[PDB]
Amino acid sequence: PLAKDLLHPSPEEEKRKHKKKRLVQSPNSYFMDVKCPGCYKITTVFSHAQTVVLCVGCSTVLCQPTGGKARLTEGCSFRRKQ
Amino acid sequence: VRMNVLADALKSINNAEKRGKRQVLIRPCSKVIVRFLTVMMKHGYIGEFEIIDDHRAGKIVVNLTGRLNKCGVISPRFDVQLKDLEKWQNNLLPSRQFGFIVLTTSAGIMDHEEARRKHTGGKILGFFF
Amino acid sequence: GRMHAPGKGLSQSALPYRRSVPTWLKLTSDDVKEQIYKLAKKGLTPSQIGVILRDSHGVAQVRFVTGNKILRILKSKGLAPDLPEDLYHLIKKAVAVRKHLERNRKDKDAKFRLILIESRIHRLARYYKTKRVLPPNWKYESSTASALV
Amino acid sequence: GKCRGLRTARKLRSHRRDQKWHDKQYKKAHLGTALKANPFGGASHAKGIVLEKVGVEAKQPNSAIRKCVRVQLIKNGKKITAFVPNDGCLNFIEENDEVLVAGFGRKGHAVGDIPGVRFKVVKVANVSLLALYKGKKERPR
Amino acid sequence: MKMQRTIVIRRDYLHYIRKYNRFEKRHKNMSVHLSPCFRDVQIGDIVTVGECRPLSKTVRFNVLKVTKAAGTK
RNA sequence: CUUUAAAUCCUUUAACGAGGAUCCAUUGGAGGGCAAGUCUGGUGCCAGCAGCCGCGGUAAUUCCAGCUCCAAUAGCGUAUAUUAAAGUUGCUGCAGUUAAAAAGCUCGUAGUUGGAUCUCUCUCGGCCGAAGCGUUUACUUUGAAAAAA
RNA sequence: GUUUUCGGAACUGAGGCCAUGAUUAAGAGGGACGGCCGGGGGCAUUCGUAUUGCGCCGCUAGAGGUGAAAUUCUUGGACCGGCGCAAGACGGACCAGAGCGAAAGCAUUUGCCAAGAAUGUUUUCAUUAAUCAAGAACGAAAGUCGGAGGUUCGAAGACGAUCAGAUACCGUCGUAGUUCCGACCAUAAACGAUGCCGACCGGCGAUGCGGCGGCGUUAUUCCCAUGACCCGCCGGGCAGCUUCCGGGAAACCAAAGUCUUUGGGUUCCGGGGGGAGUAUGGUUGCAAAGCUGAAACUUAAAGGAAUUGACGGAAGAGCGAUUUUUGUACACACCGCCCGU
Ligand SMILES: [Mg+2]
Ligand SMILES: [Mg+2]
Ligand SMILES: [Mg+2]
Ligand SMILES: [Mg+2]
Ligand SMILES: [Mg+2]
Ligand SMILES: [Mg+2]
Ligand SMILES: [Mg+2]
Ligand SMILES: [Mg+2]
Ligand SMILES: [Mg+2]
Ligand SMILES: [Mg+2]
Ligand SMILES: [Mg+2]
Ligand SMILES: [Mg+2]
Ligand SMILES: [Mg+2]
Ligand SMILES: [Mg+2]
Ligand SMILES: [Mg+2]
Ligand SMILES: [Mg+2]
Ligand SMILES: [Mg+2]
Ligand SMILES: [Mg+2]
Ligand SMILES: [Mg+2]
Ligand SMILES: [Mg+2]
Ligand SMILES: [Mg+2]
Ligand SMILES: [Mg+2]
Ligand SMILES: [Mg+2]
Ligand SMILES: [Mg+2]
Ligand SMILES: [Mg+2]
Ligand SMILES: [Mg+2]
Ligand SMILES: [Mg+2]
Ligand SMILES: [Mg+2]
Ligand SMILES: [Mg+2]
Ligand SMILES: [Mg+2]
Ligand SMILES: [Mg+2]
Ligand SMILES: [Mg+2]
Ligand SMILES: [Mg+2]
Ligand SMILES: [Mg+2]
Ligand SMILES: [Mg+2]
Ligand SMILES: [Mg+2]
Ligand SMILES: [Mg+2]
Ligand SMILES: [Mg+2]
Ligand SMILES: [Mg+2]
Ligand SMILES: [Mg+2]
Ligand SMILES: [Mg+2]
Ligand SMILES: [Mg+2]
Ligand SMILES: [Mg+2]
Ligand SMILES: [Mg+2]
Ligand SMILES: [Mg+2]
């Protein structure tokens, strides 16, 4: 109120705002490397996926799409990229 | 929809000036807006401003000094001849000792006194005092 | 707000500031183009192709990788539909509503929605005529609509 | 709100032209029905022949008998009630006399207690009522 | 282009109204003579005409140059 | 005398020409708006005045008069058209919850309006001369032509 | 005289060469996709009491209706109790300052059909947009014309009361109608008495939808995970409280603010009160009527908000007047004012 630095918002201030209402737009999504226990291939999956991702080698359902994010199958591990 | 960007920028600046704020954020940016703010800053009404560069149309953060009474836009942009300028000065400015009308001429964007010195007309953009 | 609804939603995508391809992506431009060609030959619209590339192959933005958009790549190769996909979807929805409405004469809401859909179709068709994507004689007629799509 | 476009001159002019007709005085002056209904026909004065003498009762809360004359105009033949303003001036007017009549001061509207009277007598038998009242001129006879 | 060797063109302009400081859109129609030397003339292309003696009741101009529309391929 | 075709008028000049210097200034008003008397005599919701509010029914600041007093003045009242007053036609510059007022609702052609962005030329003739300029306009600043009254 | 110099114009071939040629993807808009969400719409199907009538059984002289009664039905069994049957209409309680729809409007179960908002998105097109003469779709109730049904209620009407009088209010019946299908009609205090699109300008606590994050209680016997709670964040939505943001004649309004410091875009629309939404012309309709729409004439006020009184068969702060609750069109104050023959 009457004194606020618009040029330099705090890092927690900019992660609380809407993604479009920030000083510079930035998505809330990310890509991840996922691995199923049965098969050794590593698959790149978008966090907010809209399609069922099947393992090419062994036809394993890696994830199921939902309203907001795609949920990984039980026993599958993932790590964020960069 | 939004059809005038300078109008929104000037309205935001005026509203923030009335509330005693120290800084204003105006989006989207425009080179006409930058020229208008430069004209205002040369006379000491606003102060330094910074252009934030996203990859889409930019934004501006403007510092305020408390010296601005009213900044406004004229719509539509009427053609002003050099002999009709005194009528607009009488209609829009509060006194003959201060206040400026902003014009876009073929020489550039300037105030009415600088347009008298350079002996040219143009189109009226807005005013501030 | 919406063209034909009072709603004023704000949901959309926000592209990142950086336009550089990420380091982990091993695909080249030619491999991405070959994937796009194979998906198009499978019978997928550019939107579906982009969704598949984003979800499975880690291709966030093809225009960042290959320097070109999906539709322009298809047009350069020659695997592009005669009429644009959005107009095709609008006409297909109009056909579906009209097929429903003939068996239900008392459905006034269907008539209202059909009027709205055909208004959007006329808007888009006029825009595409202006850009010469469609010949300046293309007309949307209800009888012809079933054969058109 | 009003349109402020740079090419809206036709819209503004047409709207003003059409909305001027809702002004009572503009429509009265430019329609032509008032001029047709006006017994004088747009003149300041007129001449008539005194048909008779009448007395009009003053409207409440006033009580009086205002002396007037029924006359008939010479140029169009219309019949008119005119007021003879002064103390005892009705004795200066005879029947079948010729009188000059003017308006009452409110442009066709009734003035004061007198109901429906908008004209007054100026001269009778070619001499002014003021001169007869002040005893400067006599009736011609 | 429906008469024999003569076409109808439209000229558009803006008329200034002093009271409101604004403009209104106006147009005029001209019947002009088109020579057979000019072919492939379509509706909507620009034509430069010159004044001459009255050729008929309503024709006083002759087509001098034809330039195509912006959509030419 | 001069003036003028001849005159008249004005100007110039002899003689006569002012005390009540009678060689006499009028037109409208005196409750407010609006400057100026609830002074005296009549009349008594009558006669009348009064653009409007109002006055007059036995002590009328408003009628009819006398006196006195105001305003402009060789001029001053009245009727009517018109302009300002009218930001009560609003482009400048009006309004639309309850004072007059937003269509029952939506679509839609014409009209109006429309988001950011891009820092003179070869040749031919004597540096200039010819020729193409400008993708073209709008705008603004010049210049030329523009009856007097 | 021929051809070749020179000059002008046109059609064919690979060349070299360009940094070779597509600005971005709007807290603009369309169209894909994902999981949801809702008394949104149409069709079919299903259930629930209740009301009316009919059949049978039991006991009985009253029952119904009202301020009080009467008209009315009753030993040719009324009303009341029990067991069934038939028809038609409506979906109680749950049901809320809750949701959906452009508005009228929308609530028993299940299935089918098409449609939609919001949220999520590092998908696609790339200005395709806003408001709108002309022209169109929809549009409560009542009303009109044909078919089908007609339980209840019920304009008109016939009666019984009340009353000085009632042609009303009250009660008994009761015709159109109320219900469904097909054609018309386009009117409501169709109201938030408030046009739509866009920007900015204070707090607080809830609530509906979607998404995101996080200790801890519960159910799916274990495990995640998904439902029910709890604490927060973001985005649209219906609203509420508070404030010397500022407005306004005030009542009040976070919009009815950002207006003499007067210009974001655009549509409709008002000009003192009556005559009058009347006459006439045009147009639409079977009709009823709908849309467009005057003038002559008459009048000095009519009207809005608020204050103090008077009445009632009611319980330092404000521009300023001014400083038991409440309503007022009264202020000569209900012995008022006022409407029509
Ligand atoms: Mg729209
Ligand atoms: Mg969305
Ligand atoms: Mg009186
Ligand atoms: Mg002007
Ligand atoms: Mg005098
Ligand atoms: Mg006197
Ligand atoms: Mg006076
Ligand atoms: Mg005075
Ligand atoms: Mg009076
Ligand atoms: Mg006396
Ligand atoms: Mg006296
Ligand atoms: Mg005037
Ligand atoms: Mg003025
Ligand atoms: Mg007037
Ligand atoms: Mg002004
Ligand atoms: Mg007004
Ligand atoms: Mg009203
Ligand atoms: Mg409304
Ligand atoms: Mg249009
Ligand atoms: Mg622009
Ligand atoms: Mg001239
Ligand atoms: Mg001149
Ligand atoms: Mg349904
Ligand atoms: Mg029974
Ligand atoms: Mg809604
Ligand atoms: Mg129920
Ligand atoms: Mg219309
Ligand atoms: Mg109905
Ligand atoms: Mg009905
Ligand atoms: Mg019937
Ligand atoms: Mg009854
Ligand atoms: Mg009954
Ligand atoms: Mg209506
Ligand atoms: Mg309401
Ligand atoms: Mg209304
Ligand atoms: Mg909320
Ligand atoms: Mg909801
Ligand atoms: Mg939630
Ligand atoms: Mg204004
Ligand atoms: Mg009126
Ligand atoms: Mg009148
Ligand atoms: Mg005090
Ligand atoms: Mg005070
Ligand atoms: Mg009441
Ligand atoms: Mg009171």
Please explain how this structure is put together.
It is classed as translation. The entry lists the keywords inhibitor, mRNA channel, 40S ribosomal subunit, translation. SARS-CoV-2-Nsp1-40S complex, focused on body. Chain A: 40S ribosomal protein S27. The structure is cut from a larger assembly and holds chains A (82 residues), B (129 residues), C (149 residues), D (141 residues) and E (73 residues). Chain B has helices at residues 5-18, 31-42, 85-92, 112-118; strands at residues 23-26, 49-52, 59-63, 71-73, 79-80, 100-105, 109-111, 122-128. Chain B starts with a helix and ends with a strand. In chain B, strands 4, 5, 6, 7 and 8 form a 5-stranded antiparallel beta sheet that branches. A 3-stranded antiparallel beta sheet of chain B has the order 1-3-2, covered by helices on one side. Chain B contains 4 helices and 8 strands; from the N terminus they run αβαββββαββαβ. Chain B folds into 2 domains: 1-68, no CATH class; 69-129, no CATH class. Chain B is α+β, with helices and mostly antiparallel strands and 129 residues long. Chain C has helices spanning 29-42, 46-56, 62-65, 70-77, 85-103, 108-130, 142-148. In chain C, helix 1 (29-42) crosses helix 4, helix 5 (85-103) packs antiparallel against helix 6 and helix 5 (85-103) packs across helix 7 (142-148). The longest helix of chain C has 23 residues, at 108-130. By secondary structure, chain E is mostly beta strands. Chains A and C meet through strand 2 of A and helix 2 of C. Chain C binds 2 RNA strands through helix 2, helix 3, helix 4, helix 5 and helix 6.
Write a brief structural summary:
Chain D: Its main location: cytoplasm. The structure is cut from a larger assembly and holds chains A (82 residues), B (129 residues), C (149 residues), D (141 residues) and E (73 residues). Chain A is mainly β and 82 residues long.
Overall morphology of chain C: elongated
Question: For the CA atoms, what is the radius of gyration of chain C?
Answer: 19 Å
Q: How many DSSP H or I helices of chain C?
A: 7
Domain count of chain C: the total is 2
The total domain count of chain A is: 1
Structural class call of chain A reads mainly beta
Order of helices and strands of chain C: HHHHHHH
Return the string of H and E elements of chain A: HEEEEEE
Number of helices of chain A: 1
Distance between the termini of chain C: 29 Å
Oligomer: part of a larger assembly
Number of strands of chain A: 6
Q: Largest interface, and how many residues on either side? A: A-C, 18 and 18 residues
- Total beta strand runs of chain C: 0
Strand portion of chain C: under 5%
Taken as a percent bin, the fraction of beta residues of chain A is: 25-35%
For the sheet with most strands of chain A, the description reads: 3 strands, antiparallel
Span from first to last CA of chain A? 37 Å
Family (chain A): Belongs to the eukaryotic ribosomal protein eS27 family.
Region (Disordered) (chain A): 1-22
Zinc finger (C4-type) (chain A): 36-58
InterPro entries (chain A): Ribosomal_eS27, Ribosomal_eS27_Zn-bd_dom_sf, Ribosomal_zn-bd
